[PDB]
Design a binder for this molecule. Structure first.
Ligand SMILES: Nc1ncnc2c1ncn2[C@@H]1O[C@H](CO)[C@@H](O)[C@H]1O
Ligand SMILES: Nc1ncnc2c1ncn2[C@@H]1O[C@H](CO)[C@@H](O)[C@H]1O
Ligand SMILES: O=C(NCO)c1ccccc1
Ligand SMILES: O=C(NCO)c1ccccc1
Ligand SMILES: O=C(NCO)c1ccccc1
Ligand SMILES: O=C(NCO)c1ccccc1
Ligand SMILES: O=C(NCO)c1ccccc1
Ligand SMILES: O=C(NCO)c1ccccc1
Ligand SMILES: O=C(NCO)c1ccccc1
Ligand SMILES: O=C(NCO)c1ccccc1
Ligand SMILES: [K+]
Ligand SMILES: [K+]
Lengths: 330, 330
């Protein structure tokens, strides 16, 4: 009897969300569908050009932890906010979802991270992230008892951008593995993979990471190829389990030579793709820690992702457990 | 040419929005469908019990001004935030909509007002508002040139709760009337009417207010009757024009002995009624300042209200001008 099914570790971020036209992205040199890092000056500039917005707690791993709790699993989260209103919002939303969260702010500056996310008519999301307080996350923030007591510890590739977060992750990998737990990561973003390609491959090949999440674009970026079949063959050789998502084409779960293909769920409309990969990881990891088959893990991932893309905001506002029951998955 | 069609004046608030069950309201002694004033201690208590939430700029008059701008009218706003992140969000959202907003914060404390709004399955909204920096709004915040150059100055009955806002409003009424403009108010909330019944009647009877907005519950509270026909007859005698909304039953515009009845729009589903009255006022006041008939003003009001109730959050995220064009209201 362990205390947590899934610990996640990521950049703690509040999202600021608006719709825009395609030309807005071009005019402002925003890379479509990507996570674009920005400084404080650029943050104020972009905000001045953004329309009326909505705020919602975000952060890739934060969303994943919230998803696992929503499904009925037991989640914990490490991430660093500031002692400010955005940080209070972030802390409230994750704890109110039933995620064990106790990372203490270090002060009011830098302020809590925020990401201006522009959603185009096709439902694609383009994020512009000022990391703020996330740069302070370090080994001091590792609750060792929580890592030791979690079936899986999952983290963002995005943590390679701030300076010291990787040290916390290496500590987590050591503690998790010494206690017989598993480590998992998401490749996060194809440009993130481009920045840290060798480091990410080393995480997998050295066995610090057991389960890897990627979408098509991230897998292609990892091996610097446009051949998807090649990318799947390569990723399967580099990690114990890979879960690769393909948007409207569903997902494929790889284990050695084993491949499990899962369909995307039928949807009403792609309102906003923000959170899709995060919630895929929620469903997958919930299923995994409940002892379900790899195929069923994929099915739970696709359900949760399919739900989140039909709403504005990155964390489902409806019950995923109720959805899973209805879909005959639980 | 004036500079503004509609100046609005109200409590500058950021909304914190969540769905709840019917029992939540009862367990927490929250008056359903009402605006419930709360202190800082109660705000922290209620927030601790609230689920994960979404934030969106609110304030009844703020919403109204944003609605006028969305329709293509020229709006201005007076309302006081703090120099904090919530205030920054408020300032951004209203200015980004093209509302002329210049009210400077006086410091960081008290913090910017927020309202915890609980939306039940029927789409009714129950608000719990900590006024914060709104208590500092006073005569010093009246931009006399803006009032002088606005065709209509509209304000909330809610302004009677903070201590000095009413003095600002009396100054506005003087300036507006000296420049041949009109004054309008909304009764805001039936308990608000109960607190300030005598004062509201005096505003109307003394001619400080020319156009009054009410819903059924506010009209009934004003005259302390459950006879709606009686309330209509009475309100028509007390103000030059009364616009009275009746939820799904539409609206009626009264001027002397004249009555103009308007149908509600038919709805797919009522998602969240937050902002309905505020956007009815946007549509009405946009029509009024464009020289439209009272019936057409009522039609523009009902269109805007019908749109806002079909989304989460109090300010339409779609184009009201586009909707009005499609409706042949133009
Ligand atoms: N640099 C980043 N690190 C972690 N998460 C991020 C980053 N930028 C944006 N996000 C989050 O990605 C989520 C969608 O996957 C959004 O909720 C947003 O908060
Ligand atoms: N005391 C108040 N004064 C002005 N507006 C309020 C108050 N309480 C809640 N609101 C606003 O009423 C709006 C809905 O009419 C919400 O957007 C909310 O911000
Ligand atoms: O946040 C950044 N780096 C990690 O600390 C950043 C900011 C602006 C531009 C590029 C990277
Ligand atoms: O005002 C807040 N915190 C103290 O500055 C606050 C505001 C909104 C949500 C949570 C906390
Ligand atoms: O190599 C990439 N894609 C596959 O051809 C790549 C490179 C830089 C940024 C994103 C993807
Ligand atoms: O690791 C490779 N690419 C990513 O940098 C690689 C190495 C040898 C052959 C093909 C791909
Ligand atoms: O804010 C209040 N009044 C106006 O300043 C208030 C707060 C809590 C309870 C009652 C009124
Ligand atoms: O960080 C902000 N302001 C300085 O404290 C901020 C955050 C969100 C929206 C606007 C401003
Ligand atoms: O008088 C009221 N309603 C009409 O019967 C009333 C009184 C207090 C609060 C709300 C409505
Ligand atoms: O003004 C009245 N009620 C609200 O206080 C009133 C006065 C006389 C007769 C009926 C209603
Ligand atoms: K979404
Ligand atoms: K609404």
């Amino acid at each position: 009897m362990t205390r947590f099914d899934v610990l996640t570790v990521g950049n703690a971020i509040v999202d600021i969300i608006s719709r825009c036209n395609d030309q807005f992205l071009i005019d402002n040199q925003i890379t479509k569908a990507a996570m674009n890092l920005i400084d404080a000056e650029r943050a104020e500039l972009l905000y001045s050009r953004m329309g009326p917005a909505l705020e919602a707690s975000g952060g890739s791993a934060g969303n994943t932890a919230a998803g696992v709790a929503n499904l009925g699993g037991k989640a914990a989260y490490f991430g660093n906010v500031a002692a400010d209103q955005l940080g209070d919002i972030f802390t409230h939303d994750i704890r109110a979802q039933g995620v064990h969260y106790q990372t203490k702010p270090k002060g009011a500056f830098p302020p809590t991270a925020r990401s201006m996310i522009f959603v185009t008519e096709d439902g694609e999301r383009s994020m512009n992230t000022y990391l703020g307080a996330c740069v302070e996350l370090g080994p001091e923030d590792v609750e060792a008892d929580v890592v030791a007591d979690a079936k899986v510890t999952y983290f963002e590739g995005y943590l390679w951008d701030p300076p010291r977060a990787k040290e916390a992750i290496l500590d987590c990998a050591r503690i998790a593995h010494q206690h017989g737990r598993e480590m998992s990561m998401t490749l996060s973003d194809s440009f993130c993979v481009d920045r840290y390609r060798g480091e990410f491959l080393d995480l997998m090949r050295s066995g610090k990471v057991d389960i890897v999440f990627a979408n098509r674009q991230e897998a292609l970026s990892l091996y610097q190829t446009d051949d998807f079949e090649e990318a799947l063959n390569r990723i399967a050789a580099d990690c114990k389990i890979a879960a690769v998502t393909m948007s409207e084409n569903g997902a494929v779960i790889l284990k050695g030579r084993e491949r499990y293909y899962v369909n995307a769920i039928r949807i009403r409309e792609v309102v906003d793709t923000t959170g899709a990969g995060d919630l895929f990881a929620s469903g997958f990891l919930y299923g995994y820690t409940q002892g379900r088959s790899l195929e069923d893990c994929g099915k739970l991932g696709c359900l949760a992702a399919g739900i989140v893309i039909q709403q504005i905001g990155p964390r489902p506002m409806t019950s995923l457990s109720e959805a899973a029951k209805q879909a005959g998955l639980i």
